[PDB]
Design a protein around this ligand. Structure first.
Ligand SMILES: *[C@]1(C(=O)NCCC)O[C@@H]1C(=O)N[C@H](C(=O)N1CCC[C@H]1C(=O)OCc1ccccc1)[C@@H](C)CC
Length: 251
């Protein structure tokens, strides 16, 4: 394994790998880390580009994935992909795909031209129809995963998984000091526990002797380092290596 690895540079034909989404004022990180990585993988292992709908995952998985905007379980999300599949859907108001995200983007712990996130958002309805004008139908726009699995809390195996099969979904404890992250390699030193946060890990590297994981947050691009952040790697910091899940697309 190389000292560094950026899925964005390794798979130039998969632009989803470099894009940052915005979960809005809804605790839907579990769904976002999932559809983002799933999007990357459909592209990696089918070479076709598809914006996997966060809306379909967030609203239709149900109990098997948790409680919608109230939080969910990453592994549960990948299961839904293999069982019910996911339709396409782009950003809020983009009219891209079968089911674009329906929750407005907002400012996540930063000032900007968007409304500030309120964290209090209701889970949207599970509607099995596509936006007007889109084709094919909801049922025919479904993309299925052929396997859902969990990678062990092992730095090397996690790297090998990313190296070989692409970005995976992870989760870690977010403390208040992470909210203000701007650059460098994040290490928890102070702040109250905010809860678990599911995200997308797409690579790793070493910055000034400090090993890290390259992560894509889902708080838009004006948060952190263009929506991404680096986090200490190798010591299960904030449990970043304790809940890695992934899967493979069919055929
Ligand atoms: C992710 C988010 O959008 N965070 C923004 C603010 C930091 O609150 C979102 C989420 O999906 N979190 C999950 C969660 O906290 N859950 C899921 C069920 C309810 C709630 C909970 O009480 O979880 C504790 C729990 C841990 C281990 C097993 C079962 C339950 C997180 C589990 C995912 C990172």
């Amino acid at each position: 394994l190389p000292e560094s690895f950026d899925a964005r540079e390794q798979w130039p034909n998969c632009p989803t790998i470099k894009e940052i989404r915005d979960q809005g004022s809804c605790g839907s990180c579990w769904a976002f880390g999932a559809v983002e990585a799933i999007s990357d993988r459909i592209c990696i292992h089918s070479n076709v580009n598809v914006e996997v709908s966060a809306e379909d995952m967030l609203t239709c998985c149900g109990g098997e994935c948790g409680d919608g905007c109230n939080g969910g379980f990453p592994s549960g999300a990948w299961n839904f992909w293999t069982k019910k599949g996911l339709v396409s859907g782009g950003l809020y108001n983009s009219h891209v795909g079968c089911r674009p995200y329906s929750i407005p983007p907002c400012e996540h712990h930063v000032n900007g031209s968007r409304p500030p996130c309120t964290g209090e958002g209701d889970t949207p309805k599970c509607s099995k129809t596509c936006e007007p004008g889109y084709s094919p139908s909801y049922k025919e726009d479904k993309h299925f995963g052929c396997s859902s699995y969990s990678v062990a809390n092992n730095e090397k195996e996690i790297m090998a998984e990313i190296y070989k099969n692409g970005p995976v979904e992870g989760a870690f404890s977010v403390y208040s000091d992470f909210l203000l992250y701007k650059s460098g390699v994040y290490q928890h030193v102070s702040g109250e526990i905010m809860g678990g946060h599911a995200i997308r890990i797409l690579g790793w590297g070493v910055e000034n002797g400090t090993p890290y994981w390259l992560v894509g947050n889902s708080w838009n691009t004006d948060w952190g380092d263009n929506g991404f952040f680096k986090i200490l790697r190798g010591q299960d910091h904030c449990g970043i290596e304790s809940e890695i899940v992934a899967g493979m697309p069919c055929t």
